[PDB]
JSON list of C-alpha atoms in Angstrom, two decimals:
[
{"chain": "A", "resi": 1, "resn": "UNK", "atom": "CA", "xyz": [-33.52, -14.27, 15.89]},
{"chain": "A", "resi": 2, "resn": "UNK", "atom": "CA", "xyz": [-30.00, -14.81, 14.76]},
{"chain": "A", "resi": 3, "resn": "UNK", "atom": "CA", "xyz": [-27.47, -14.86, 17.87]},
{"chain": "A", "resi": 4, "resn": "UNK", "atom": "CA", "xyz": [-24.77, -13.02, 16.33]},
{"chain": "A", "resi": 5, "resn": "UNK", "atom": "CA", "xyz": [-22.03, -15.86, 16.72]},
{"chain": "A", "resi": 6, "resn": "UNK", "atom": "CA", "xyz": [-18.57, -16.42, 15.65]},
{"chain": "A", "resi": 7, "resn": "UNK", "atom": "CA", "xyz": [-18.20, -18.18, 13.48]},
{"chain": "A", "resi": 8, "resn": "UNK", "atom": "CA", "xyz": [-16.40, -20.80, 15.32]},
{"chain": "A", "resi": 9, "resn": "UNK", "atom": "CA", "xyz": [-13.61, -18.39, 16.02]},
{"chain": "A", "resi": 10, "resn": "UNK", "atom": "CA", "xyz": [-10.88, -19.31, 18.84]},
{"chain": "A", "resi": 11, "resn": "UNK", "atom": "CA", "xyz": [-8.18, -17.72, 20.19]},
{"chain": "A", "resi": 12, "resn": "UNK", "atom": "CA", "xyz": [-4.67, -19.05, 20.51]},
{"chain": "A", "resi": 13, "resn": "UNK", "atom": "CA", "xyz": [-1.37, -18.11, 21.44]},
{"chain": "A", "resi": 14, "resn": "UNK", "atom": "CA", "xyz": [2.58, -18.44, 20.39]},
{"chain": "A", "resi": 15, "resn": "UNK", "atom": "CA", "xyz": [4.26, -22.32, 19.99]},
{"chain": "A", "resi": 16, "resn": "UNK", "atom": "CA", "xyz": [7.53, -22.01, 23.28]},
{"chain": "A", "resi": 17, "resn": "UNK", "atom": "CA", "xyz": [10.95, -21.62, 21.94]},
{"chain": "A", "resi": 18, "resn": "UNK", "atom": "CA", "xyz": [8.95, -21.15, 17.61]},
{"chain": "A", "resi": 19, "resn": "UNK", "atom": "CA", "xyz": [10.76, -19.73, 15.27]},
{"chain": "A", "resi": 20, "resn": "UNK", "atom": "CA", "xyz": [10.52, -18.41, 11.94]},
{"chain": "A", "resi": 21, "resn": "UNK", "atom": "CA", "xyz": [12.37, -20.70, 9.11]},
{"chain": "A", "resi": 22, "resn": "UNK", "atom": "CA", "xyz": [12.18, -20.76, 5.08]},
{"chain": "A", "resi": 23, "resn": "UNK", "atom": "CA", "xyz": [8.15, -21.36, 4.52]},
{"chain": "A", "resi": 24, "resn": "UNK", "atom": "CA", "xyz": [6.94, -18.65, 3.17]},
{"chain": "A", "resi": 25, "resn": "UNK", "atom": "CA", "xyz": [3.08, -18.01, 3.04]},
{"chain": "A", "resi": 26, "resn": "UNK", "atom": "CA", "xyz": [1.25, -17.11, -1.08]},
{"chain": "A", "resi": 27, "resn": "UNK", "atom": "CA", "xyz": [-2.68, -16.31, -1.65]},
{"chain": "A", "resi": 28, "resn": "UNK", "atom": "CA", "xyz": [-4.33, -15.01, -4.91]},
{"chain": "A", "resi": 29, "resn": "UNK", "atom": "CA", "xyz": [-3.66, -11.41, -3.73]},
{"chain": "A", "resi": 30, "resn": "UNK", "atom": "CA", "xyz": [-0.79, -11.03, -3.95]},
{"chain": "A", "resi": 31, "resn": "UNK", "atom": "CA", "xyz": [0.23, -7.85, -2.07]},
{"chain": "A", "resi": 32, "resn": "UNK", "atom": "CA", "xyz": [-1.49, -9.52, 0.98]},
{"chain": "A", "resi": 33, "resn": "UNK", "atom": "CA", "xyz": [1.29, -12.35, 0.92]},
{"chain": "A", "resi": 34, "resn": "UNK", "atom": "CA", "xyz": [3.79, -9.68, 0.63]},
{"chain": "A", "resi": 35, "resn": "UNK", "atom": "CA", "xyz": [2.90, -7.56, 2.88]},
{"chain": "A", "resi": 36, "resn": "UNK", "atom": "CA", "xyz": [2.74, -10.72, 6.14]},
{"chain": "A", "resi": 37, "resn": "UNK", "atom": "CA", "xyz": [6.46, -12.53, 3.87]},
{"chain": "A", "resi": 38, "resn": "UNK", "atom": "CA", "xyz": [7.95, -8.69, 4.58]},
{"chain": "A", "resi": 39, "resn": "UNK", "atom": "CA", "xyz": [6.47, -8.60, 8.48]},
{"chain": "A", "resi": 40, "resn": "UNK", "atom": "CA", "xyz": [8.54, -11.84, 9.05]},
{"chain": "A", "resi": 41, "resn": "UNK", "atom": "CA", "xyz": [11.11, -11.66, 6.96]},
{"chain": "A", "resi": 42, "resn": "UNK", "atom": "CA", "xyz": [11.17, -14.47, 4.62]},
{"chain": "A", "resi": 43, "resn": "UNK", "atom": "CA", "xyz": [14.36, -14.87, 2.52]},
{"chain": "A", "resi": 44, "resn": "UNK", "atom": "CA", "xyz": [14.57, -17.39, -0.79]},
{"chain": "A", "resi": 45, "resn": "UNK", "atom": "CA", "xyz": [15.02, -19.88, -1.04]},
{"chain": "A", "resi": 46, "resn": "UNK", "atom": "CA", "xyz": [11.44, -20.10, -0.09]},
{"chain": "A", "resi": 47, "resn": "UNK", "atom": "CA", "xyz": [11.16, -23.75, 1.82]},
{"chain": "A", "resi": 48, "resn": "UNK", "atom": "CA", "xyz": [7.81, -24.20, 0.93]},
{"chain": "A", "resi": 49, "resn": "UNK", "atom": "CA", "xyz": [4.68, -22.48, 0.21]},
{"chain": "A", "resi": 50, "resn": "UNK", "atom": "CA", "xyz": [1.83, -22.25, 2.07]},
{"chain": "A", "resi": 51, "resn": "UNK", "atom": "CA", "xyz": [-1.68, -20.27, 1.02]},
{"chain": "A", "resi": 52, "resn": "UNK", "atom": "CA", "xyz": [-4.41, -18.53, 2.33]},
{"chain": "A", "resi": 53, "resn": "UNK", "atom": "CA", "xyz": [-8.18, -17.83, 1.04]},
{"chain": "A", "resi": 54, "resn": "UNK", "atom": "CA", "xyz": [-10.34, -15.15, 2.02]},
{"chain": "A", "resi": 55, "resn": "UNK", "atom": "CA", "xyz": [-13.50, -16.64, 3.93]},
{"chain": "A", "resi": 56, "resn": "UNK", "atom": "CA", "xyz": [-15.80, -18.33, 3.30]},
{"chain": "A", "resi": 57, "resn": "UNK", "atom": "CA", "xyz": [-12.78, -19.81, 0.72]},
{"chain": "A", "resi": 58, "resn": "UNK", "atom": "CA", "xyz": [-11.12, -22.22, 3.29]},
{"chain": "A", "resi": 59, "resn": "UNK", "atom": "CA", "xyz": [-8.92, -23.77, 1.55]},
{"chain": "A", "resi": 60, "resn": "UNK", "atom": "CA", "xyz": [-5.63, -22.07, 2.03]},
{"chain": "A", "resi": 61, "resn": "UNK", "atom": "CA", "xyz": [-3.23, -24.22, 4.56]},
{"chain": "A", "resi": 62, "resn": "UNK", "atom": "CA", "xyz": [-4.35, -20.87, 6.38]},
{"chain": "A", "resi": 63, "resn": "UNK", "atom": "CA", "xyz": [-7.07, -19.16, 6.12]},
{"chain": "A", "resi": 64, "resn": "UNK", "atom": "CA", "xyz": [-8.23, -15.06, 6.70]},
{"chain": "A", "resi": 65, "resn": "UNK", "atom": "CA", "xyz": [-11.71, -13.38, 8.76]},
{"chain": "A", "resi": 66, "resn": "UNK", "atom": "CA", "xyz": [-13.20, -10.39, 8.14]},
{"chain": "A", "resi": 67, "resn": "UNK", "atom": "CA", "xyz": [-11.66, -7.76, 10.27]},
{"chain": "A", "resi": 68, "resn": "UNK", "atom": "CA", "xyz": [-15.40, -7.24, 12.22]},
{"chain": "A", "resi": 69, "resn": "UNK", "atom": "CA", "xyz": [-14.88, -10.52, 14.59]},
{"chain": "A", "resi": 70, "resn": "UNK", "atom": "CA", "xyz": [-11.18, -8.94, 16.26]},
{"chain": "A", "resi": 71, "resn": "UNK", "atom": "CA", "xyz": [-12.01, -8.86, 19.56]},
{"chain": "A", "resi": 72, "resn": "UNK", "atom": "CA", "xyz": [-9.51, -8.46, 22.13]},
{"chain": "A", "resi": 73, "resn": "UNK", "atom": "CA", "xyz": [-9.72, -12.12, 23.43]},
{"chain": "A", "resi": 74, "resn": "UNK", "atom": "CA", "xyz": [-7.79, -12.88, 20.40]},
{"chain": "A", "resi": 75, "resn": "UNK", "atom": "CA", "xyz": [-5.03, -10.29, 21.25]},
{"chain": "A", "resi": 76, "resn": "UNK", "atom": "CA", "xyz": [-2.49, -13.03, 21.06]},
{"chain": "A", "resi": 77, "resn": "UNK", "atom": "CA", "xyz": [-3.80, -14.37, 18.04]},
{"chain": "A", "resi": 78, "resn": "UNK", "atom": "CA", "xyz": [-6.52, -16.76, 17.07]},
{"chain": "A", "resi": 79, "resn": "UNK", "atom": "CA", "xyz": [-7.79, -19.80, 14.70]},
{"chain": "A", "resi": 80, "resn": "UNK", "atom": "CA", "xyz": [-10.98, -21.66, 13.88]},
{"chain": "A", "resi": 81, "resn": "UNK", "atom": "CA", "xyz": [-12.30, -24.97, 14.45]},
{"chain": "A", "resi": 82, "resn": "UNK", "atom": "CA", "xyz": [-8.59, -26.67, 13.81]},
{"chain": "A", "resi": 83, "resn": "UNK", "atom": "CA", "xyz": [-7.30, -24.17, 11.08]},
{"chain": "A", "resi": 84, "resn": "UNK", "atom": "CA", "xyz": [-5.56, -20.58, 11.93]},
{"chain": "A", "resi": 85, "resn": "UNK", "atom": "CA", "xyz": [-6.98, -17.22, 10.62]},
{"chain": "A", "resi": 86, "resn": "UNK", "atom": "CA", "xyz": [-5.55, -14.04, 10.40]},
{"chain": "A", "resi": 87, "resn": "UNK", "atom": "CA", "xyz": [-7.32, -10.57, 9.65]},
{"chain": "A", "resi": 88, "resn": "UNK", "atom": "CA", "xyz": [-7.74, -9.00, 6.72]},
{"chain": "A", "resi": 89, "resn": "UNK", "atom": "CA", "xyz": [-10.14, -5.38, 5.54]},
{"chain": "A", "resi": 90, "resn": "UNK", "atom": "CA", "xyz": [-10.39, -5.20, 1.31]},
{"chain": "A", "resi": 91, "resn": "UNK", "atom": "CA", "xyz": [-7.75, -8.25, 0.66]},
{"chain": "A", "resi": 92, "resn": "UNK", "atom": "CA", "xyz": [-4.80, -6.27, 2.11]},
{"chain": "A", "resi": 93, "resn": "UNK", "atom": "CA", "xyz": [-3.32, -6.10, 5.35]},
{"chain": "A", "resi": 94, "resn": "UNK", "atom": "CA", "xyz": [-3.21, -2.40, 6.61]},
{"chain": "A", "resi": 95, "resn": "UNK", "atom": "CA", "xyz": [-0.80, -0.96, 9.69]},
{"chain": "A", "resi": 96, "resn": "UNK", "atom": "CA", "xyz": [-4.06, -1.92, 12.51]},
{"chain": "A", "resi": 97, "resn": "UNK", "atom": "CA", "xyz": [-4.04, -5.66, 11.92]},
{"chain": "A", "resi": 98, "resn": "UNK", "atom": "CA", "xyz": [0.16, -6.07, 10.99]},
{"chain": "A", "resi": 99, "resn": "UNK", "atom": "CA", "xyz": [0.21, -5.71, 14.16]},
{"chain": "A", "resi": 100, "resn": "UNK", "atom": "CA", "xyz": [-2.10, -8.24, 15.66]},
{"chain": "A", "resi": 101, "resn": "UNK", "atom": "CA", "xyz": [-1.01, -10.40, 12.23]},
{"chain": "A", "resi": 102, "resn": "UNK", "atom": "CA", "xyz": [2.69, -9.79, 13.33]},
{"chain": "A", "resi": 103, "resn": "UNK", "atom": "CA", "xyz": [1.32, -13.19, 16.45]},
{"chain": "A", "resi": 104, "resn": "UNK", "atom": "CA", "xyz": [-0.52, -15.73, 12.86]},
{"chain": "A", "resi": 105, "resn": "UNK", "atom": "CA", "xyz": [3.31, -15.67, 12.22]},
{"chain": "A", "resi": 106, "resn": "UNK", "atom": "CA", "xyz": [4.55, -17.19, 15.52]},
{"chain": "A", "resi": 107, "resn": "UNK", "atom": "CA", "xyz": [2.07, -19.33, 15.81]},
{"chain": "A", "resi": 108, "resn": "UNK", "atom": "CA", "xyz": [3.22, -20.99, 11.97]},
{"chain": "A", "resi": 109, "resn": "UNK", "atom": "CA", "xyz": [6.73, -20.75, 12.53]},
{"chain": "A", "resi": 110, "resn": "UNK", "atom": "CA", "xyz": [8.38, -23.82, 14.48]},
{"chain": "A", "resi": 111, "resn": "UNK", "atom": "CA", "xyz": [10.51, -25.08, 16.73]},
{"chain": "A", "resi": 112, "resn": "UNK", "atom": "CA", "xyz": [13.62, -25.00, 15.54]},
{"chain": "A", "resi": 113, "resn": "UNK", "atom": "CA", "xyz": [16.96, -23.15, 17.40]},
{"chain": "A", "resi": 114, "resn": "UNK", "atom": "CA", "xyz": [19.57, -22.19, 15.18]},
{"chain": "A", "resi": 115, "resn": "UNK", "atom": "CA", "xyz": [22.98, -21.98, 17.59]},
{"chain": "A", "resi": 116, "resn": "UNK", "atom": "CA", "xyz": [24.95, -22.48, 14.46]}
]
């Protein structure tokens, strides 16, 4: 008896008019957060330092899940019960999981125009 059900995993979508800021993300695996901070063009000084943790470590502000749960349901990104999630493989990002990860970053963006 088993049902191979997800870890309460629910899609989402990016926020309207949201835009990147000077947040930085962090994680125990330096590469993971370094590769993510690369994708979105993070430039210091970093206004804040969020963290990521790999399941079942979910003490990071944002969390990660194993790529085996990446259904096309989650095409526009996903989240756990109430926290945002990403795909990780071997504690890293690869070209495979990079493309979907950019969507998570568009959810961590916040609604602030740069009309200056």
